[PDB]
């Protein structure tokens, strides 16, 4: 299917305790392949997938240089934004940046994005056409005017539509043995008695990749969101993911309920029923 390369950058100020924490991570689809952490020993960009380890010293030196530049910008930004909102020096604040690119099944450029948040909510973002900005408030409009004066959108568009996709294609080829794989979910159902007259049915998907999946409950063939619970899709730790969906039903009526599982690895969606 489609593929993505995404970088995630987090900086957290530490009032009265020095320089901000800075963490960068890179993903291809749902697979992490690099990291930088200010807390760690190397102070370099580091590999987290075997297929990126093979890149030579100039790659790692370059990525280290650039990611350090990202860190510096965030450190300045924390002070700048503290100024924009006239906040005190007493509080910790957060800057987050995410950017990257999607290609389709044909590996051709599909879309690009760049989003920026202050203290956990939208601050400024590139619009879909990659030619203008959306600012959250007047403070963010200051940043918008600065980035317009510096023609950031033009430069960034050149990266997202070109360089980003070139890297993504290189990585997709070099890591093909693991990145271009589909692991179908292993499914099963469990039952709990809530009371003498109510029961929980829990529908399980395990060991799947990519992370994208849909679990739905139906009663008599009709969608049911009432009395249902969906947990966040979670990493197993081996490169695969897990998820479950539960519904509370009247005891004796279990047979009316079906769990439906949609995944890339299931050309035909699955329908599970309690025994």
């Amino acid at each position: 299917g489609s593929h993505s390369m995404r970088y995630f950058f987090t900086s957290v100020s530490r009032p009265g305790r020095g320089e901000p924490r800075f963490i960068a991570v890179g993903y291809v689809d749902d697979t992490q392949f690099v990291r930088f952490d200010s807390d760690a020993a190397s102070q370099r960009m580091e590999p987290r997938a075997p297929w990126i380890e093979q890149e030579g010293p100039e790659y790692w030196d370059g990525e280290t240089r650039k990611v350090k530049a990202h860190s510096q910008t965030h450190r300045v930004d924390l002070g700048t934004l503290r100024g924009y909102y006239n906040q005190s020096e007493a509080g910790s604040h957060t800057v987050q940046r995410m950017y990257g690119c999607d290609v389709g099944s044909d590996w051709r450029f599909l879309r690009g994005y760049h989003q920026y948040a202050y203290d956990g909510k939208d601050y400024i973002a590139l619009k879909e056409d990659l030619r203008s900005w959306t600012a959250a408030d007047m403070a963010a409009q200051t940043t918008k005017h600065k980035w317009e004066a510096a023609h950031v959108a033009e430069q960034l568009r050149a990266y997202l539509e070109g360089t980003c996709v070139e890297w993504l294609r290189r990585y997709l080829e070099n890591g093909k043995e693991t990145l271009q794989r589909t692991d179908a979910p292993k499914t099963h159902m469990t039952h709990h008695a809530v009371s003498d007259h109510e029961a929980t049915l829990r529908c399980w998907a395990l060991s799947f990749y990519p992370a994208e999946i849909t679990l739905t409950w139906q009663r008599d063939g009709e969608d049911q969101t009432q009395d249902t619970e969906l947990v966040e899709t979670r990493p197993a730790g081996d490169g695969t993911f897990q998820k479950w969906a539960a519904v509370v039903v009247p005891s004796g009526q279990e047979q009316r309920y079906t769990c439906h599982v949609q995944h890339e690895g299931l050309p035909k969606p699955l329908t599970l029923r309690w025994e």
């Binding site: 970088y7 960068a24 890179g26 790659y59 370059g62 990525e63 650039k66 990611v67 530049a69 990202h70 910008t73 965030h74 300045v76 930004d77 700048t80 934004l81 940046r97 950017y99 920026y116 601050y123 400024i124 940043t143 600065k146 980035w147 510096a150 950031v152 960034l156 990266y159 360089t163 980003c164 890297w167």
Partner: peptide, 9 residues
């Protein structure tokens, strides 16, 4: 590979 550098806000 990451973007070359980021502009200050």
């Amino acid at each position: 590979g990451v973007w070359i550098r980021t502009p200050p806000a």
